[PDB]
Amino acid sequence: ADRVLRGSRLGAVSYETDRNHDLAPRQIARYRTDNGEEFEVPFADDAEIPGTWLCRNGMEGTLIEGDLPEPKKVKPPRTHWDMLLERRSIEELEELLKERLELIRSR
Amino acid sequence: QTDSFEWLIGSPRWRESAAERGDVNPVGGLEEVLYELSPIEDFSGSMSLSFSDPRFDDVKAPVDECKDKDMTYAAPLFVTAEFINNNTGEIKSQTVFMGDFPMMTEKGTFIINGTERVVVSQLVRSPGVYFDETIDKSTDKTLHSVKVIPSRGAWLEFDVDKRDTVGVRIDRKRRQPVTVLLKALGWTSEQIVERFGFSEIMRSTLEKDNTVGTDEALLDIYRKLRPGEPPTKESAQTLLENLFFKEKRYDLARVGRYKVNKKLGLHVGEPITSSTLTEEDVVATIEYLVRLHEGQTTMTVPGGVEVPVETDDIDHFGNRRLRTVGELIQNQIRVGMSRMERVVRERMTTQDVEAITPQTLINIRPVVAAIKEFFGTSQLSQFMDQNNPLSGL
Amino acid sequence: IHARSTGPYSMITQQPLGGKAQFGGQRFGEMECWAMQAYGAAYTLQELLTIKSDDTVGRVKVYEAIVKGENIPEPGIPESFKVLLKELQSLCLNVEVL
Amino acid sequence: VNFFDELRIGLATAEDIRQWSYGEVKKPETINYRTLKPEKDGLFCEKIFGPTRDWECYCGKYKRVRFKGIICERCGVEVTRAKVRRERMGHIELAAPVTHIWYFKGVPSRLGYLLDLAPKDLEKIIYFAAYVITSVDEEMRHNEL
Amino acid sequence: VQELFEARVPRGKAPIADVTGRVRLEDGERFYKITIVPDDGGEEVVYDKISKRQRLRVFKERVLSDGDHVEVGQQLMEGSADPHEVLRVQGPREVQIHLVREVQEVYRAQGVSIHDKHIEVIVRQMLRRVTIIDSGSTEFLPGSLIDRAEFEAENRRVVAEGGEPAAGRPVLMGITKASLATDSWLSAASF
Amino acid sequence: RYGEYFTGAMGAESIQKLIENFDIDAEAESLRDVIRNGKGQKKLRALKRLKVVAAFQQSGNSPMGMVLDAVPVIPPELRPMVQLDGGRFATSDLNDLYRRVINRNNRLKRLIDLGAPEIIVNNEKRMLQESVDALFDNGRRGRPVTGPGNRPLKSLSDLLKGKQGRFRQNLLGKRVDYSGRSVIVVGPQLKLHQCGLPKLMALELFKPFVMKRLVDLNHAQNIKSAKRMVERQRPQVWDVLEEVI
Amino acid sequence: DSVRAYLKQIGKVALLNAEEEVELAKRIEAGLYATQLMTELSERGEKLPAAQRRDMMWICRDGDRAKNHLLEANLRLVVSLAKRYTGRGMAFLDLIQEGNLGLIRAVEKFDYTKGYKFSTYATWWIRQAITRAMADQARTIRIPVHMVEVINKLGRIQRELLQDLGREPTPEELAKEMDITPEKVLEIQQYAREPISLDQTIGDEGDSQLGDFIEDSEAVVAVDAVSFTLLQDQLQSVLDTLSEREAGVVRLRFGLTDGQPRTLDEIGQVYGVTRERIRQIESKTMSKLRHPSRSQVLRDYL
Ligand SMILES: [Zn+2]
Known about the structure:
Chain B is α+β, with helices and mostly antiparallel strands and 393 residues long. Chain B has helices at residues 2-5, 12-20, 29-37, 63-69, 178-183, 189-196, 203-207, 214-225, 234-238, 254-264, 280-292, 325-344, 347-350, 358-361, 365-375, 389-392; strands at residues 40-41, 47-56, 74-85, 92-102, 110-112, 115-119, 122-125, 128-135, 142-149, 156-157, 298-301, 304-308, 320-323, 381-383. The relative contact order of chain B is 0.13. Chain D is of the alpha+beta class. Chain E: It comes from Mycobacterium tuberculosis.
């Protein structure tokens, strides 16, 4: 299919001029990960400072400060114990473990 | 080019034309794939399918229209097939529209999507027997080989060692001896002396043959085949006769048949046509080989014409033929049915018995896919250079 | 006949692209460069393989300098060269310049 | 710089590679099928590789040159050029150690010298066919033998 | 010429003399039979098998024969000369002039005038490195090829330390073979 | 029984235990003692080993990098993805290979947390290792990874080695602009320092320069009247052209 | 090829039947209730003696032994079910792994008082893992699974109906029969295709690639770029020749010195004036801009 054919990138092309002055001012927080790090992350000077943030490591961490908002909202996994307790009862496992624990109790 | 086309169709002009110049029983080019292809047989042996009567309908548009409206210059194709039950016999005969079929002009041309394109003739070496003699540079002596090639199969070479004796590896499996081919072929060691003892270098093969017993060495032949498999009575003779006496996968050329007769001085006054390999030709080229490497000039054969002994040429025209376009398109229809029928026999089982018409078994689609597949993307199909009538010629 | 001052380029590389409806581009070889070494006219070579081949950000500079008729700017780093360095950095290589 | 003295090559240590990159992805995705925009944590991840559109965050809240060097923390993308996406290297941390191939299958195997081992025996190690003793104390075996 | 720059074994093999003296010339089993007697003398040098198609060499006074006085390194038959053995016998300075006359003859046969110093430039890279016959005292692996100026710079620091008898011969090697031994490593990557 | 005493494992983490619990020096001077004593296939093995043990012995490196616990990723524009007209997408081959990597890392990564029999574990780690191997170089270990059409893919070394190599990327040479070609005839009235020039091609070449000069005297307003006026080939360009050549 | 070492690996396993894993389920469930018995034992304290420690620790190891024995017994089930869905989409070892995970979930959700074959139980989870994994990791562009529903149904009606007509169907016919618009099925036919690779040869000799031929319409043209800056320069040279007020009204209005279009009251807010005062000076400025001496140098700049 050797013919003069055009395709496409995605994104934007701009012919804006260059300069190194009159930019918006900033603010610097230094978030702290679990593995003892300080990451100078520049933020725009008019902004909010959130609690959790994925960092340059590729992990999340806490702030420079010691707010400690919440170690919560996570859920336990659906374990095999729950999948047992759906189709089997507590009496089933108590008497069944009286059977098996009898069987090792009589060896 | 005009008489090359002419033939897959098989014109009445072709019929008389290739009927007055000898040509006793002319058969069609499509027919040449039919009678080797039909009849179609299942593995159970309980039903059967047959083909007959290749013919053609009329054109659908003239050349000015086709070149104008950028189509193919084609015409329909009918072949009357028949399903035949083997248990009771059935007459399901049904002329099935096999598909469209491209057509050649009286200009000798073809029109694909309006484009005028040309089929190039492709020179290939003819299959057959190729004798050769080489001289080594260690001890400077004379070894005598032959390479015998079929069409669409494996190869076999009858060589001569730098020492004693021979080189008889088939499909390149290290070496064989000549006698185990003959004794395991079902022949006595006595007739090795009687027919092939004059011819005394092979007496050393009968000395160092190192195995007495027909199947006792033929098990070692199957050990030369795989290696490492317990042989049965299948792999003794029948597997070997699936490589040289079953004409379903090992099929040398019709001309290569004629070339074997023509070289070997066979029964040549014969109207025969086959692709089967006798072993009598094999022992014939054995004895021609040893009469070559004993030093001679001439040779006759019991039951056939005498032959002047000589080496072969490589680039001689009698060794290098031409596949014409009808042979090219013949190969493309051959592979098109090779890809077409290979699910049809598969669906001879899994389709419902008594509920199948020949229409339900034929897929005409991969055939025309093979045709339009062929005219595209081939370096044998090129544009017509139309800038000089000389150039187009 | 072929001729070009400025036209289309590739998307893989920054090289000029040449076909029928393209202006064509002129493929500059190897022994050519050997003879350029044989003169030793190295500023010509630095003109050739950089601002004419692969560095995008120079082309606007030298073209605009020609527009204003200002000085020829110095040829910056061939960025196509640095692409190789990133390929080496992809494969467990502490490569470094000093 | 354009004042180069040498160009020296070594093995890149693990800490320097994770000092090189700007993040680690975790999804096998390129873009969306419809809006054709890059997804999170996949290929072309704007959050660690940069703006595909010029000075435009994915939040779309800032567009201008005066907003540069700053981070839309809604989009998580620093505002800059798009051409620097031909420069930013990524990484993937592993769940287990992984040997490099060019020391093993290269001839001669510098691994095979490096601990004085056979190549064929090392092959069944790294393709997990058998165990090997890597460290054993000699005190307790010695006196308690 | 292409083989004469990579300097492999020429097919026109004819040995040269090894010592001054006289010759004992005989025939052999389809070849010839050659024996050199030394001039001092000592061990007589015998050459066995050179094919009779490869016939005698002409010297000046008219034709090589038996009982003839033998020079240092005079070639015995027609054909071609081995570089390595005349390197082993007469010295590098000669082998220079030899290769000059050989290539120069080839351009003279078509009559194309090429100045000698370019050939000399190509010569200079061919004898840069020496081998390690004996390790001596300092890390020199035998079977390796090492730059001469580095070898003499390493033997320049011959402050006592135990003596360093690292032995080696001047080594000719083919220009591809020589070209492999670089330091730049990306020209080496360019193969 | 006796599992309290030894340590045994399989694969690369045990290999890392070998590397960490290894010293250069006593091995090195041990091979010095061998090359003092041994000879033949007792010193030559210590020779071939002593070169590379000497190599780690010289530089301030470590054999830590020979195993890996983090795999880098090349920038995306070296594996760029292009859509043609009509919604025709094209990209590099490496990307789905990386996808095999990330799917095996997340797959193992989730599978460990449950716990498993070890038959699963060496299977998944083995698939991981071969994914790394096919990432670096296809076809080195066993069967090459092929995709559609049963044709092999392009690995990292494929970008480096071969007919796309450093000659074939850099030193192959390439095409540049401000150039052209045509057929030639004789100019027998010229001089040596002189040459002739076809003028349509000449004006086609010298476009930005004449576009500069024609605006300088007031024949034009801007670049746009300049370039458009060139594309019209108006007759006012020619006397400018002898000045600019 | 790890199929040799992996069939070689699983070939050491003995096959099992129903009544065994009936008891082995009691061993495993005894393991889990010994496990939660151990955790509640850690809750209340009051640790049982050594025999009543080794019995629950023993049966916790026992449920792992019979559990892993069952998993070993059904790796052969993973192979035997998975071994025909090849030739498309994904490598076979991946199918092994996801069949293993679906078999893990089926082990987690199996009951023996229901009285069935264990494989016939697990078959929904195994094939469901096939649909999930092949739904996920088989395409360069990930398509949601509800569209994959009509990919399967569309290839079914398209292939079988393609046999029904005996030839290639038309999109309006599929729009008729699958009860949609032709633009719908045309969009699906656009979505169904695999992306073309980049690195294959162009059909012939043999050295070049495909990447030499890619035309960018988003390319960096030079002449407009230089044109843009000098255009801005002409904006400066022309726009600074008007009055002091109108410069600030147009610049602060149109987003020129800052880059943002503003409301009416925003630039009148800094001046302390009305919206109508801004609109009459700005509109009269628009009358000043159509004075043609300025427009003559700016007409070609369109
Ligand atoms: Zn944003």
